[PDB]
Design a protein around this ligand. Structure first.
Ligand SMILES: [Mg+2]
Ligand SMILES: [Mn+2]
Ligand SMILES: [Mn+2]
Lengths: 312, 301
């Protein structure tokens, strides 16, 4: 055992014994601002609040209603053959991190293609504050003030408000974000697998060549590698494990992770704290809105960077 | 640089660019419980609140008044020859970590011996948990700790009494009643910059002749203690060059001020002569920072 490995062992053993990040707390009532700050924000600890929201959207947001309310405008949509936008796929003996095929099409076309269980996998996943930038009308059916219990801890308005509408086959592969995340399912349900930052040494991460999904004149999908001016591949660091069916012989370290499963239904709120690993699945035609707030830096970020150094 | 040292250098580089724990925040008024939780508790960030308390004590309490109040009672007094209780001391060519000679003498003699610079260094340290204090003024912090104080300690002592650098595993709310207290503080993540050593523990004892000496303490093979080796006021940067990378903070806390010293922060304390203070300890609520700190301790072992 190296000294670095001994230190990582100490970290994991202490966090296990102290029950750090070992569960998703489940509440039936929205907590006070002080409660949220003390018990979840300051501990970097996820919580799900059941049936917290009765926004008008939760009732009325249907694909048909959205087509009418948005005037059937053209929307940006991501397409993959496999359902893994921003995810690993193999071609000609090489594993790539692949970006989705991104295109524009009328919302009605998106919905028609969500109804074809055979064709390519579609997802309105653009994030980048796509709700407030590209679909501001939708904001009228939300009451963001209801999120105050959490916002007072972040102490700033959302840095992004995002809209998700997805196929059942669209899976978000495990990754982390540098934001505090308040996730609100409007219709259907989302299934989360979550892993806390301090378990970084149990999550295998690899450096992969990057590609993008393109389609041939025949409509056949393939991966086009991104190979830049310097000649080399364009590389991306990405989580290597599939949480739904992990290969513990290939990745012994993942045996030491304790992933947490939570399902979030229409009207539920999920607080996903900054730098938590998450893998996301969804019911068919699931609609969700999420609010991202920039993180307030402390020593835990510096420790996380140190862990990245140690596990490199 | 080795693997462990490359990791520590990454830690310190990231904390230096973000200036983590680079300043003791200064406040004019007592914050809300939410403000304190969001800004200070959750960030492990020390803060000093100026002229925050208007307790009766701050006016009344003196050696003279305390005499008449408790009535010349016998009190728990700590005594040292050098003024370094829980500090390092040399004897027989070997450096020891020495606990204080603890005794019980009546409080009128304490005051007499305080202004004799000829004698030993004395100070009173009591853990009794009154009507001259408005403890509710600290609710803002209590609500963030979500439990009453685990201890309330009274302190009265000599300017010669120096509390050497060390860390505590609890949240500290320090309230100065009379005089001022000088703190040198160091963030926990700078542990690798603070040189530590293993020392044989002892206790101070007086002779037939009243002469002080360190009695090596034992359980046989005698006990040992890990203790910080550097003196922050006159550091030896040639003997301890890693300490050049630490960035200590200095803060003076006056009568009526409140200092929040977060758990596991290194601190070296001094004070004016006959300074009086109280402080409230709260047992920490364990989080990821503590686990990282145990890891960091393993890396600097
Ligand atoms: Mg796998
Ligand atoms: Mn994400
Ligand atoms: Mn202390």
């Amino acid at each position: 055992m190296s000294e670095v490995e001994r230190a990582l062992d100490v970290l994991l053993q202490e966090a296990e014994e102290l029950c750090i990040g070992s569960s998703v707390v489940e509440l039936d009532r929205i907590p006070t601002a002080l409660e949220f700050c003390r018990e979840f924000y300051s501990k970097n600890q996820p919580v799900v609040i059941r049936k917290a929201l009765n926004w008008p959207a939760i009732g009325k947001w249907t694909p048909k209603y959205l087509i009418e309310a948005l005037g059937d405008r053209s929307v940006d949509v991501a397409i993959t053959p496999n359902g893994y936008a921003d995810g690993l796929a193999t071609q000609n003996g090489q594993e790539y991190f692949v970006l989705p095929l991104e295109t524009k099409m009328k919302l009605s076309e998106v919905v028609r293609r969500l109804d074809d269980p055979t064709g390519a996998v579609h997802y309105i996943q653009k994030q980048n504050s796509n709700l407030s930038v590209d679909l501001p009308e939708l904001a009228a059916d939300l009451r963001v003030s209801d999120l105050d219990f959490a916002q007072q801890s972040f102490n700033k308005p959302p840095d992004a408000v995002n809209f998700w509408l997805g196929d059942e086959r669209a899976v978000t592969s495990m990754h982390k974000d540098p934001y505090e995340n308040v996730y609100c399912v409007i219709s259907g349900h989302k299934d989360f697998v979550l892993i806390p930052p301090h378990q970084l040494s149990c999550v295998p991460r690899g450096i992969y060549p990057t590609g993008v999904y393109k389609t041939s004149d025949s409509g056949q999908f393939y991966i086009e590698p991104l190979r830049d001016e310097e000649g080399s591949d364009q590389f991306t660091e990405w989580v290597s494990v599939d949480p739904l069916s992990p290969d513990l012989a290939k990745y012994p370290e993942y045996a030491r992770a304790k992933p947490l499963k939570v399902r979030v239904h229409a009207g539920d709120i999920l607080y996903l704290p900054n730098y938590w690993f998450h893998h996301v699945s969804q019911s068919h035609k699931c609609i969700a809105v999420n609010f991202w707030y920039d993180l307030d830096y402390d020593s835990r970020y510096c420790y996380y960077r140190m862990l990245e150094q140690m596990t490199s």
